[PDB]
């Protein structure tokens with residue numbers, strides 16, 4: 001008693017929008033630092049009937065039976081996850097059930113400190129995530145600032161984490177957890193100095209490595225696993241998995257953390273896991289551990305350095321004047337345009353990026369930069385020499401944005417009226433589409 | 443720079459477990475009340491490249507651009523959801539971003555009451571969900587009992603909601619929310635009498651209709667939308683959608699609820715939505731509104747009534763002695779076997795069901811029943827006539843479970859040793875497989 005007609009027939013309306021979406025992804029220079037493109041195998045897992053199964057609890061200790069094949073999948077994912085990040089299953093544990101990055105972090109934090117517990121994280125405006133305690137005078141914006149007592153540390157006026165301030169804060173504030181690893185931080189993290197600070201005050205070290213997961217995995221950047229009690233990571237960004245998350249916990253530094261984290265995920269916060277996700281995460285974690293994927297990750301950094309260099313060559317300023325990873329933050333103050341305006345301009349030429357705060361921005365209202373990253377375009381096959389063209393297109397959008405602002409004014413709603421029909425944008429869009437539409441597409 | 447070899451090639455190990463899972467689904471009598479089988483269209487959406495896109499925020503008010511086609515999908519889903527549940531988009535709103543039922547409920551509750559807020563729900567042992575405030579003497583098991591102050595109301599000795607007890611509790615406890623709609627409740631709900639008690643104390647009315655959603659949509663059961671301030675539902679049980687959830691909120695009764703709920707979902711709790719889910723939910727919410735799906739739903743009730751009847755004909759006792767919906771709870775006290783033992787026995791014959799508490803069970807340690815339901819098998823094409831066979835197989839499993847307990851004793855570890863090799867189980871397994879394997883399978 002069901003309709004098994006294909007998507008095209010069953011729902012032509014939805015199917016057109018999805019074919020349109022696919023064409024827009026195919027014809028876009030995607031510079032969203034947090035985005036990537038999943039291969040066919042990962043997407044086959046996500047559409048697999050394994051998502052029909054309710055399997056609350058953990059492998060073996062399920063509430064229901066009929067979960068023998070689901071237990072192998074979930075155990076195969078855990079194993080492949082510990083292998084990928086070069087950790088011993090005797091020393092480290094992993095929970096593979098969190099539905100996404102934000103859930104993973106709220107659950108893990110709750111395990112460690114509970115309700116009313118004290119946490120420290122980087123401010124959102126300085127490159128921290130919402131789930132690192134974000135609030136503002138007017139509201140406890142994140143649940144992590146409300147169900148916990150959070151305090152927030154800032155980067156210095158050059159974009160770097162200020163460890164002297166972290167200590168000043170940790171000593172007086174006395175948190176049970178300090179969060180490092182960030183959403184728009186263009187440099188590597190000194191986890192050892194974090195570990196040193198946490199020991200001093202008795203707090204846990206929480207490393208959220210969602211943006212830099214592949215680099216840690218492939219030993220191209222510092223290893224938080226040497227110093228951290230907990231590591232969380234999304235699986236959908238540079239790692240190139242599905243939309244999901246992983247929580248890692250250091251059993252040796254903290255026996256009985258295994259039970260706190262697993263119970264926090266279920267039954268404290270979640271119900272039934274999403275086994276299609278777990279299958280998909282398994283499939284990608286095998287690719288992660290090949291030598292092929294290390295080649296890819298290295299290309300991400302090569303492309304990002306080259307992109308950094310070419311933008312500097314065209315006199316564009318970058319936060320910290322460079323990058324040690326996949327992402328760059330462009331400081332747009334010298335052109336007197338906001339990041340929102342350039343985001344719209346770039347949207348009109350099929351260039352995907354996001355507006356992003358810089359150290360000088362007091363508020364998160366009207367951010368003065370944009371963030372770009374290379375994982376997506378590196379997946380689509382761009383090499384070092386391709387970065388001069390992206391740098392060229394970005395330079396040309398900044399110039400056009402400046403022209404349009406002069407003509408139409410500095411109000412965002414007035415600015416946008418200039419965008420449609422603009423001859424240079426149409427020319428530039430066309431140039432973007434021709435280069436983008438040609439690149440390999442999974 | 444990626445590997446596009448198909449799943450079989452890329453990962454043969456995983457592909458075999460998944461093909462084994464599919465074989466086990468096809469050769470199982472699935473009586474899990476909360477499970478169903480998604481069609482090919484829903485599973486095409488789930489594997490769509492739309493999950494590559496980060497689209498934090500809500501349609502139009504997005505944080506990034508490039509979200510034109512994602513905005514159409516998310517607006518199409520919202521529209522189709524309001525249509526399906528016969529609500530006016532002027533009077534009701536819907537959030538389509540919650541990743542699953544439990545997330546949906548924690549976010550909705552938080553919107554309404556905040557941290558430390560007071561809530562009331564059905565106890566887990568009496569058929570409530572974990573996210574309805576479940577705790578026990580030893581621990582606050584759900585975050586809903588910890589981040590909130592919860593109190594729990596029990597059903598009476600016959601398994602009915604005791605409204606006189608809800609008022610006894612609501613008047614002294616003074617909660618800000620009262621939760622109704624349940625996980626293993628075999629009867630319909632008097633929402634009007636709940637709306638009467640909530641008005642009396644000034645609490646909100648929260649209806650979690652995850653298990654009975656299709657009935658509510660098709661006007662086969664009472665309509666909580668006439669009385670409730672908030673309605674939540676999962677999309678993957680009787681509704682037959684993907685794994686996701688919907689939060690509905692009553693603008694008319696509570697202006698300013700819209701912002702509270704949307705802000706609770708993001709950015710309080712979640713990050714980026716999962717657009718493959720949203721697409722899939724859209725795809726199914728179209729099927730839901732057809733007269734065909736109302737036929738399916740009606741059949742679920744016909745099968746459940748017939749199943750109830752046939753088990754009573756074989757002298758098996760049901761909690762409340764019957765059912766008004768898709769599910770039955772079987773009381774196993776007269777056979778002196780636990781639900782856990784019958785769940786193992788049934789797993790051995792490819793019968794999927796779960797252990798479930800009954801009113802007499804003081805604790806959750808030894809549940810004295812099993813819960814069964816018909817949506818899955820009704821999807822696979824079973825009619826009223828076929829329920830005698832299911833009832834026969836379940837009676838035969840109960841008998842075998844009684845035999846095995848006599849021989850090996852009442853310890854579960856001992857009981858299980860009797861299971862492998864048992865001739866009648868192998869015989870009954872084979873009967874189940876032969877009938878199950880034949881049935882239509884999406």
Ligand SMILES: Cc1[nH]nc2c1[C@](c1cc(F)cc(N3CCC(CCC(=O)O)CC3)c1)(C(C)C)C(C#N)=C(N)O2
Pocket residue numbers: 124125126127128129130139141183184354355356357364367498505705708709
């Ligand atoms: C959307 C989002 N999520 N997490 C982020 C962001 C980032 C961001 C950029 C931006 F321009 C604005 C914002 N917000 C501004 C304040 C918002 C508060 C909304 C509310 O009060 O409900 C929360 C999101 C957040 C980008 C990576 C997209 C950000 C920055 N800068 C940082 N650090 O992290």
Ligand SMILES: Cc1[nH]nc2c1[C@](c1cc(F)cc(N3CCC(CCC(=O)O)CC3)c1)(C(C)C)C(C#N)=C(N)O2
Pocket residue numbers: 056063263266267566567568569570571572583625626796797798799806809
């Ligand atoms: C697994 C689960 N989730 N939500 C449920 C259940 C049900 C359930 C059945 C059952 F036999 C046991 C349980 N639990 C017993 C207590 C458990 C506490 C675990 C902990 O201490 O962390 C949580 C799950 C929960 C079934 C529908 C499967 C249940 C019942 N009875 C009710 N009412 O709702």
Ligand SMILES: Cc1ncc(COP(=O)(O)O)c(CNCC(=O)O)c1O
Pocket residue numbers: 033034100101102103105129131181182183184208209210211234244496712713714
């Ligand atoms: C450090 C960090 N942690 C957690 C998350 C949450 O992921 P979910 O969206 O899966 O909840 C993000 C995503 N940040 C968005 C971006 O950088 O574009 C992140 O950057």
Ligand SMILES: Cc1ncc(COP(=O)(O)O)c(CNCC(=O)O)c1O
Pocket residue numbers: 054270271272475476542543544545547571573623624625626650651652653676686
């Ligand atoms: C009434 C109710 N609400 C919320 C949920 C949570 O759904 P997720 O598993 O998607 O978090 C359930 C799960 N029902 C479990 C069962 O009956 O088998 C439920 O029964």
Ligand SMILES: [Cl-]
Pocket residue numbers: 046274276277488716718719
């Ligand atoms: Cl999914």
